[PDB]
Amino acid sequence: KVENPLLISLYSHYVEQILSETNSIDDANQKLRDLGKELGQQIYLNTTKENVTTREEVAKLIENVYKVLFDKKPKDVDMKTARGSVRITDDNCVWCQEVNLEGMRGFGYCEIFSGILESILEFKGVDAKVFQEMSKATGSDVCVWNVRLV
Amino acid sequence: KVENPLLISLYSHYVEQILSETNSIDDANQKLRDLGKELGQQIYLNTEIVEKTKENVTTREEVAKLIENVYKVLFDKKPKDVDMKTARGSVRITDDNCVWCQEVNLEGMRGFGYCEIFSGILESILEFKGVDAKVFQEMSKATGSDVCVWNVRLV
Ligand SMILES: [Zn+2]
Ligand SMILES: [Zn+2]
């Protein structure tokens, strides 16, 4: 049923602490992003000829990174809706399984992945900004992260 | 292949900051046990455990069976050794492939229980099933030993 109970419980603890420490939902989001960026290096180590540049190559690399971290492909990788960005959709996000928060729309419970993906892309020569577009933890049907190529 | 890289990296961040802040070394172990007890409190309710064990545990055989079932639920394997020390009223848990300290190599930190979070988790779970215990880590591959070992003191 629930995949990686240990990871989701430890991350729940991290989210609880950040929420208790910050003074706004915006800053909580940014702190979770920063956490993910800090972890990206170690995650990259524990897991060809020229840096990729096209959005199709970026989307393929995103699919490969998602397979490597989560043993599966993303529900959707979309290069059409937003333009200049790639939207990653997952209907069974590992981070927010069974998490139901009320009155917290706009809080990206799963922004750690924004940071992880931003750091991994940076290591591969892809400069980007990533934020969580929506989270099932706050009522959405899926989780969506927005990767903007800068 | 490092198992569970996300969990390991997040726990590596937590121990790093919990080695930058705390006073001594033993209170760092207590902070890690406390973290583990919170995680175990949360863990008994999203249930891969409730289906795979009994609600009420008392006897020594029940305790050993509970430790093995909890290990197989949380880590998808049973530990290398579960040794019941009846004359000491304890249980020694040995694991040669602990998930927490994979590829961790800390210099001159013997006595630091890098993997005490499991002490907290197990203490909370045993407690939830009616077993008053005190769990602490005796050795950790992260600090130079060949195995990780935890001690369940039964009270
Ligand atoms: Zn999510
Ligand atoms: Zn260990």
Residue numbers in the entry:
A (entry chain A): 3 to 49, 55 to 157
B (entry chain C): 3 to 157
From the paper:
Here, we take a structural approach to assess the relatedness of these eukaryotic-like proteins in Asgard archaea, the closest known prokaryotic relatives to eukaryotes. Asgard archaea roadblock, longin and TRAPPC3 domain-containing proteins form dimers similar to those found in the eukaryotic TRAPP and Ragulator complexes. Here, we adopted an X-ray crystallography approach to compare the structures of a potential Asgard Rab small GTPase, several RBs and two TRAPPC3 proteins to their eukaryotic counterparts, with a focus on Thor and MKD1. We conclude that the emergence of these protein architectures predated eukaryogenesis, however further adaptations occurred in proto-eukaryotes to allow these proteins to regulate distinct internal membranes.
Finally, we investigated the TRAPPC3-like proteins from Thor. The crystals were pink in color indicating potential Zn2+ binding. We further analyzed the homology around the Thor-TRAPPC3 Zn2+-binding site. We found that the predicted Zn2+-binding sites and the experimentally determined sites are not completely conserved in positions of the coordinating residues, rather they appear in similar regions and appear to serve the same function in tethering the β-sheet to the D α-helix to create cavities. Interestingly, mouse TRAPPC3 has evolved to replace the Zn2+-binding site by a hydrogen bond. We speculate that Thor-TRAPPC3 may also bind small molecules, potentially being involved in ligand transport. The cavities appear to be accessible from the exterior close to the dimerization interfaces. Furthermore, we uncover structural evidence that TRAPPC3-like proteins exist in several branches of Asgard archaea and are likely to share a common ancestor gene with the V4R-like domain.
